[PDB]
Design a protein around this ligand. Structure first.
Ligand SMILES: *Cc1cc2c(cc1C)nc1c(=O)[nH]c(=O)nc-1n2C[C@H](O)[C@H](O)[C@H](O)COP(=O)(O)OP(=O)(O)OC[C@H]1O[C@@H](n2cnc3c(N)ncnc32)[C@H](O)[C@@H]1O
Length: 488
């Protein structure tokens, strides 16, 4: 019995061995791997003791440890087949502190909760993700990208310190100045180097309100040129995003529910039918007193753009309302029982030079419909992403985030996980064949060889960090990069 010495451990928290099924499922709703045990931690000491114990068994044990945040992984990257899942959200106690324009947040804290606390002090993190019901540890283990990364970099670029439980069971505090290798390694580290029990996140003064803007484009070349210019512009918009709208009808009437149109007369006629359209989603942060300054400031920035004048829809919402926007969507989908469905997502990082080529085969040919799920498309600046981290990004100075955020509500037909799978396969096949120079975000490779190809020249550094902080490959088994007890 390998789980009997687990039950022996005098934990602050405790282990669950039978009711473990929720830990055997994630957002992707495709991979299910039954863990042997679930640690409900009462302290970081409990996580340290558990990893220490697994380590103490050396190579001759199949035991693995997976930390679970909010389980937003797509292919079981938060799961542990016949191993231990650490329910990070279970880590309770007043550990969320704001000081010196920083917030020290536990690894299992949700960004929405970090924001709600941080606003009580008139501050807020600089960079975000589209959805805030995600853990600090889970996004930092990836990158954490929204429409602020062009300016502040991903979330990984706005972290000052980390408390990590290494794969040896060591509780280490690290930053650019002390244990710096471990610090840079964990960021975009896919949970391979240890468990992020705490993180210090940079804050900025929070605006009270946001002017949330949406406009349409019929020409990609114009849509992209306008995007690339706003991300490089001085005193630009606070958030910059975009979406591809394929074979969808009356999209401006599907906006009127939330947004107000600048000239409702021309907008009422505009047909969305049969033509691939492109949406530019912008925001300008402002405080009530500064409403007038902002209106003039926005008008100037919009005046340099090439969008369809009638399509300009806008709304004025509170900062929090704009940041939590996806939770509203989540709530609707939950009501229609459309939230716990397979999500065969494809998240791509496309270099600027390949974007027009990419959009030609993908949106023009490969895809006849987008109705199945939204398509995100937006450029970012490489200058804002540190090369000391584990984050895999293309070599160009400007690269695009392309996310096919597709759902499969059907067992046959168009969606249908097998249809989604094929379309995903085709896009990937084309990116290789046509020399796009694409790199995947939230990758789900099953073999070390596919991973080595992914990291490329970064592989040596990754395997070096791996042997260093997790020699027995105990941590984040579902990433599938390192088999248990594998390193040379
Ligand atoms: C579901 C979803 C995901 C998503 C998104 C919107 C939705 C609805 N929008 C995103 C966006 O705007 N930008 C972005 O960068 N990512 C976005 N995502 C994806 C999401 O960030 C990730 O799924 C991420 O993993 C965060 O989610 P979560 O907190 O739920 O963590 P996890 O899914 O359980 O596990 C992720 C991996 O990291 C390891 N892990 C988890 N916690 C830790 C800690 N504390 N320390 C170290 N490693 C950790 C897991 O084992 C797993 O490998």
């Amino acid at each position: 019995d390998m789980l009997s010495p687990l039950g022996a451990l005098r934990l602050d928290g405790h282990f669950s061995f039978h009711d473990v099924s929720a830990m055997a499922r994630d957002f992707g709703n495709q991979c299910s791997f039954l863990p042997a045990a679930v640690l409900h931690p009462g302290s970081v000491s409990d996580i340290a003791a558990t990893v220490r114990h697994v380590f103490s068994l050396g190579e001759g044990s199949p035991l693995t440890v997976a930390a679970r945040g909010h389980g937003h992984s797509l292919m079981g990257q938060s799961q542990a087949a016949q191993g231990i899942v650490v329910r990070m959200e279970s880590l309770r106690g007043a550990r969320l502190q704001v000081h010196d324009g920083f917030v020290d947040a536990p690894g299992g804290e949700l960004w929405i909760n970090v924001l709600r606390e941080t606003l009580k002090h008139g501050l807020a993190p600089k960079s975000w993700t589209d959805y805030l019901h995600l853990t600090v540890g889970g996004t930092l283990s990836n990158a954490g990208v929204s429409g602020q990364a062009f300016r502040h970099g991903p979330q990984v670029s706005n972290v000052n310190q980390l408390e990590i439980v290494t794969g040896r069971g060591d509780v280490v505090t690290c930053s650019p100045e002390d244990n710096s290798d471990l610090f840079y390694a964990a960021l975009g580290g896919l949970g391979q180097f240890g468990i992020i029990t705490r993180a210090r996140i940079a804050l900025e003064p929070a605006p009270e309100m946001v002017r949330w803007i949406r406009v349409l484009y019929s020409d990609f070349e114009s849509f992209t040129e306008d995007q690339e210019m706003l991300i490089m512009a001085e005193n630009s918009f606070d958030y910059i995003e975009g979406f591809v709208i394929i074979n969808r009808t009356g999209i401006l009437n599907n906006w009127r529910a939330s947004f107000k149109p600048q000239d409702p007369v021309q907008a009422s006629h505009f047909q969305s039918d049969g033509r691939v359209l492109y949406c530019l989603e912008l925001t300008k942060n402002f405080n009530s007193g500064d409403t007038d300054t902002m209106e003039q400031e926005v008008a100037v920035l919009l005046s340099r753009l090439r969008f369809i004048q009638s399509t300009l829809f806008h709304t004025d919402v509170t900062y929090l309302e704009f940041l939590d926007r996806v939770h509203t969507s989540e709530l609707k989908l939950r009501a229609q029982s459309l939230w716990e469905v397979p999500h065969p997502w494809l998240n791509l990082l496309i270099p600027r030079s390949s974007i027009r080529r990419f959009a030609t085969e993908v949106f023009g040919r490969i895809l006849k419909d987008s109705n199945n799920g939204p398509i995100l498309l937006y450029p970012v600046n490489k200058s804002k992403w540190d090369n000391k981290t584990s984050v895999v990004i293309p070599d160009e100075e400007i690269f695009y985030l392309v996310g096919f955020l597709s759902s499969a509500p059907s067992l046959s037909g168009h969606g249908s996980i097998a249809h989604a799978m094929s379309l995903n396969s085709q896009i990937v096949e084309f990116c290789e064949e046509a020399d796009i120079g694409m790199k995947q975000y939230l990758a789900h490779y099953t073999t070390q060889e596919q991973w080595k190809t992914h990291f490329g020249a970064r592989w040596e550094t990754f395997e070096r960090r791996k042997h260093r902080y997790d020699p027995l490959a105990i941590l984040a088994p579902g990433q599938r990069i390192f088999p248990k007890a594998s390193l040379p």
